[PDB]
Amino acid sequence: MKIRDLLKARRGPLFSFEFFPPKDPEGEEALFRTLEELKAFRPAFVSITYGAMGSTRERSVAWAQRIQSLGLNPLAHLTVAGQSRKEVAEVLHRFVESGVENLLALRGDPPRGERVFRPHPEGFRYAAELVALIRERYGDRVSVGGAAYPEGHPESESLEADLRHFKAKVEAGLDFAITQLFFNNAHYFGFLERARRAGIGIPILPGIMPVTSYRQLRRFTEVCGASIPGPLLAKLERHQDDPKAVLEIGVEHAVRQVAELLEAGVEGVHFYTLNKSPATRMVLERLGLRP
Amino acid sequence: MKIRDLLKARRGPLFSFEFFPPKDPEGEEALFRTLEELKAFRPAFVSITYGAMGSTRERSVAWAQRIQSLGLNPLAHLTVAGQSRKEVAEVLHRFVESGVENLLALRGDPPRGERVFRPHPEGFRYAAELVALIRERYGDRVSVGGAAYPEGHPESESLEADLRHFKAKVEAGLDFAITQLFFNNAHYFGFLERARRAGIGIPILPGIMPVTSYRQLRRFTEVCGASIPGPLLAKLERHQDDPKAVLEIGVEHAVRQVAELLEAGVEGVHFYTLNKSPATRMVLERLGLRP
Ligand SMILES: Cc1cc2nc3c(=O)[nH]c(=O)nc-3n(C[C@H](O)[C@H](O)[C@H](O)COP(=O)(O)OP(=O)(O)OC[C@H]3O[C@@H](n4cnc5c(N)ncnc54)[C@H](O)[C@@H]3O)c2cc1C
Ligand SMILES: Cc1cc2nc3c(=O)[nH]c(=O)nc-3n(C[C@H](O)[C@H](O)[C@H](O)COP(=O)(O)OP(=O)(O)OC[C@H]3O[C@@H](n4cnc5c(N)ncnc54)[C@H](O)[C@@H]3O)c2cc1C
Ligand SMILES: Nc1nc2c(c(=O)[nH]1)N(C=O)[C@@H](CNc1ccc(C(=O)N[C@@H](CCC(=O)O)C(=O)O)cc1)CN2
Ligand SMILES: Nc1nc2c(c(=O)[nH]1)N(C=O)[C@@H](CNc1ccc(C(=O)N[C@@H](CCC(=O)O)C(=O)O)cc1)CN2
Ligand SMILES: [Cl-]
Ligand SMILES: [Cl-]
Ligand SMILES: [Cl-]
Numbered sequence: 001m002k003i004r005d006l007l008k009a010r011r012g013p014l015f016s017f018e019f020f021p022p023k024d025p026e027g028e029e030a031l032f033r034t035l036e037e038l039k040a041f042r043p044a045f046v047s048i049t050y051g052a053m054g055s056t057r058e059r060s061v062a063w064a065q066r067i068q069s070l071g072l073n074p075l076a077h078l079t080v081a082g083q084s085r086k087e088v089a090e091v092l093h094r095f096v097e098s099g100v101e102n103l104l105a106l107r108g109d110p111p112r113g114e115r116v117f118r119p120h121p122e123g124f125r126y127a128a129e130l131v132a133l134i135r136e137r138y139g140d141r142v143s144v145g146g147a148a149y150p151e152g153h154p155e156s157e158s159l160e161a162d163l164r165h166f167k168a169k170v171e172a173g174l175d176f177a178i179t180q181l182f183f184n185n186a187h188y189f190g191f192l193e194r195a196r197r198a199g200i201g202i203p204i205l206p207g208i209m210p211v212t213s214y215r216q217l218r219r220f221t222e223v224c225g226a227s228i229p230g231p232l233l234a235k236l237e238r239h240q241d242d243p244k245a246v247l248e249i250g251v252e253h254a255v256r257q258v259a260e261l262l263e264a265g266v267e268g269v270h271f272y273t274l275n276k277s278p279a280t281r282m283v284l285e286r287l288g289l290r291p
Numbered sequence: 292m293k294i295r296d297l298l299k300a301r302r303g304p305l306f307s308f309e310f311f312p313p314k315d316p317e318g319e320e321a322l323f324r325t326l327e328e329l330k331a332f333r334p335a336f337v338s339i340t341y342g343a344m345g346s347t348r349e350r351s352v353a354w355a356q357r358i359q360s361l362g363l364n365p366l367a368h369l370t371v372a373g374q375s376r377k378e379v380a381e382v383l384h385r386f387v388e389s390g391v392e393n394l395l396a397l398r399g400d401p402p403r404g405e406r407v408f409r410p411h412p413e414g415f416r417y418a419a420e421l422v423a424l425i426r427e428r429y430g431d432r433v434s435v436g437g438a439a440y441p442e443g444h445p446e447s448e449s450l451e452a453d454l455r456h457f458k459a460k461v462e463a464g465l466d467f468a469i470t471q472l473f474f475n476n477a478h479y480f481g482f483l484e485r486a487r488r489a490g491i492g493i494p495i496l497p498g499i500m501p502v503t504s505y506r507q508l509r510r511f512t513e514v515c516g517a518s519i520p521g522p523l524l525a526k527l528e529r530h531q532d533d534p535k536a537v538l539e540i541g542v543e544h545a546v547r548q549v550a551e552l553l554e555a556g557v558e559g560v561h562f563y564t565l566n567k568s569p570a571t572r573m574v575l576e577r578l579g580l581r582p
Contacts, residue, residue, distance in 0.1 A: 006349065080568070086330055097383075107386075185551075185555070186551050186554035186555040187555075189480045189555040190482075190555040190556035192483065192484060192487065193483060193555065193556060193557070193558075194556065195487065196483060196486065196487035196491075196492055197492055197494070198492075199490075199492050201487060201488060202488075203488075260477050261479035262476040263478075263481070264476075264477070264478075264480035264481045264484065265481035265484050265485065266479075266484070
């Protein structure tokens with residue numbers, strides 16, 4: 001089913017799960033066994049992150065197919081970095097021809113943690129251009145989401161400019177958005193309020209990634225642009241050499257985050273799930289949301 | 292200044308304060324000494340609650356004039372209960388001719404000790420009818436707000452019906468709304484999300500009243516329609532006969548609420564302040580907003 005339809009129809013919050021390209025063949029098989037086990041949670045949709053510069057272009061199409069053949073609903077991530085417009089359109093075509101009904105249109109990061117993005121010579125610069133391409137070619141026959149940033153893209157000059165750019169991307173033809181991970185719910189609620197004042201009505205699903213390793217904080221702050229609230233940071237610093245303690249801290253924090261989001265009427269939660277980590281399923285189990 | 296203009300031009304949250312009709316002449320002078328002291332805080336606007344059934348209709352106009360003469364910006368509350376349309380229109384005209392630029396258009400509750408609202412036979416039935424009068428008769432000469440109910444008016448059939456009627460009130464000509472008091476921030480955030488999905492973009496300011504006595508809970512739940520979160524209700528139940536402890540519980544609860552609302556970038560906070568209670572001042576001190 002199209003995500004826009006799942007959202008309109010829901011009997012309760014939609015839970016979705018995003019995984020990562022596996023590192024080796026054993027890991028790939030283990031990921032697909034995990035997806036099979038994940039039916040226990042009745043996921044609204046599942047995805048695997050797309051390699052930013054197109055490194056996974058063939059594998060990603062085959063993964064979308066394999067997800068569908070397990071009876072799960074794939075959200076196909078697609079980026080524009082490192083790829084020509086023709087190359088992007090070819091991958092898009094292969095997803096849709098495969099029966100994919102749901103696309104997440106993304107830019108991609110610049111490589112190796114560089115601050116400044118440079119498009120491929122015959123490529124796109126902005127996710128909005130890929131949203132518009134999808135609509136030009138497929139109209140409403142697919143559902144299209146994009147990324148939202150409650151705390152702003154790191155490269156944006158202000159939250160106000162970042163919101164204007166989000167509105168422009170919505171206007172290119174998004175049906176929904178999924179946020180960047182965050183640890184401070186107030187920043188998600190603040191972004192929703194800015195969106196409301198700007199006349200944005202589409203569903204905006206919070207993205208949650210429980211902290212599972214202390215080493216993650218550098219990526220979360222430097223790449224993702226997420227802030228770590230005082231109390232959480234202090235607990236992680238105090239236990240930074242104890243991986244078991246860190247996991248429990250991250251799960252407990254995410255449980256409290258998700259409980260408040262649900263009480264605040266979110267349409268769903270999108271869980272960023274490291275392939276070998278049980279943390280996101282632990283969060284749903286602790287909230288009593290395992291069917 | 293018109294509240295619509297203050298909101299558009301704001302550089303940080305607007306803080307507003309609502310007091311109550313004084314009970315005797317010394318209480319009246321004491322209230323105006325409190326308002327004089329409040330000037331240093333630079334509130335965006337201040338108000339005194341309009342008495343049930345028109346009981347303060349002349350005093351309220353004089354009080355709005357006295358607020359102006361202190362250099363403060365009055366918000367004039369005006370209800371329709373227990374008064375003819377012509378009477379309401381007369382008080383409205385007195386406010387406008389006093390130089391009041393800001394009106395809060397309200398229905399009013401049924402009279403003390405009655406549970407059913409019945410309009411005056413030649414009066415208005417809904418706040419939206421007053422909003423419409425103001426727009427027809429004064430247009431942009433005034434800025435008009437209305438009440439919003441994150442947890443629904445008690446007498447509404449459902450939250451969906453409540454929101455539809457809120458939307459109709461907005462459409463009649465609101466520039467902003469101020470919420471009913473609440474104790475669970477998630478219900479405020481949830482209301483904003485429902486409003487966003489219904490295409491309501493006007494500023495909606497949270498109303499906060501710290502719990503100062505156990506006896507208040509009856510009014511808060513039965514008349515105001517607010518829910519009391521379990522942990523708060525537990526603490527209060529245990530300390531009913533310790534007023535000092537109840538004040539501390541209420542103040543701390545309100546501090547934590549407001550800290551999160553401010554982190555969520557609300558356009559302002561509206562404090563319901565009993566004239567002789569230090570609770571609001573204590574909240575502002577604990578937040579670092581007042582010395
Ligand atoms: C839910 C989710 C899933 C993701 N999945 C993947 C994935 O599978 N693969 C991957 O590589 N990455 C993925 N990402 C990461 C994403 O690619 C990066 O965060 C990237 O740096 C920005 O992508 P974007 O689509 O948000 O960019 P865009 O929306 O294109 O924005 C890029 C920058 O340009 C600015 N901008 C936009 N419009 C204008 C304008 N009109 N004028 C000026 N500036 C403008 C924006 O504010 C922003 O600073 C994901 C992110 C999220 C939140
Ligand atoms: C910020 C704030 C300040 C206040 N100040 C005062 C004050 O100074 N003095 C005072 O007496 N009271 C005051 N009140 C209280 C208010 O008068 C009561 O809560 C009252 O019961 C409802 O007033 P309202 O304006 O919200 O009613 P309305 O908006 O008129 O709604 C009344 C009921 O009718 C329903 N409804 C609305 N339109 C329609 C329609 N077209 N058809 C059918 N049903 C409809 C609503 O859903 C609701 O159930 C204040 C409340 C707030 C939140
Ligand atoms: N800017 C941006 N935001 C994004 C993404 C991204 O790539 N870039 N993601 C998707 O595109 C998601 C986040 N992706 C993540 C990928 C890895 C780790 C992580 O914990 N990595 C470990 C190292 C793991 C390893 O080497 O095996 C770490 O940083 O310690 C965290 C988040 C959502 N938002
Ligand atoms: N429905 C409704 N909502 C409303 C109002 C109202 O009158 N009715 N208010 C504005 O119109 C504000 C709340 N007004 C309040 C008025 C008094 C007390 C209170 O504490 N009263 C004491 C009695 C004190 C006494 O007898 O002097 C109590 O209930 O214990 C609380 C809130 C905001 N919302
Ligand atoms: Cl964006
Ligand atoms: Cl006139
Ligand atoms: Cl209403």
